[PDB]
Amino acid sequence: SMEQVAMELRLTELTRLLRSVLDQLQDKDPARIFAQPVSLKEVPDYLDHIKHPMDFATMRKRLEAQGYKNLHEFEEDFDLIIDNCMKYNARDTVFYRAAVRLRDQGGVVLRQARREVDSIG
Numbered sequence: 001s002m003e004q005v006a007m008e009l010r011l012t013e014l015t016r017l018l019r020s021v022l023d024q025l026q027d028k029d030p031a032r033i034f035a036q037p038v039s040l041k042e043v044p045d046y047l048d049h050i051k052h053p054m055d056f057a058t059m060r061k062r063l064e065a066q067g068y069k070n071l072h073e074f075e076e077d078f079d080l081i082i083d084n085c086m087k088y089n090a091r092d093t094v095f096y097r098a099a100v101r102l103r104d105q106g107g108v109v110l111r112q113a114r115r116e117v118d119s120i121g
Contacts, residue, residue, distance in 0.1 A: 021113045028105040033098045054080035
């Protein structure tokens with residue numbers, strides 16, 4: 001149907017906008033601390049601590065399959081990156097501190113993303 005095409009075009013355009021958002025957030029992690037999944041070879045107990053691991057590569061895979069239907073879903077995954085790290089790692093660590101800085105800098109980006117998603121529809 002034509003309605004199904006139009007809905008698909010909207011999803012494609014959301015995907016474009018979320019790819020630009022993802023790039024902008026990942027620039028706020030210049031150490032690449034959040035770039036890849038925590039390795040279960042290197043942190044064998046990780047899944048005893050963190051039940052829903054997340055990282056920028058995993059989000060990029062979902063995004064390229066058009067697997068985010070709305071901005072809320074995308075933000076959920078970004079918050080997992082931050083929140084998982086702030087639980088597993090202590091305050092005095094470069095990991096925790098990287099997550100704080102990513103959260104604070106990412107807030108700005110996400111605030112305007114929400115306005116764009118609402119504005120363009």
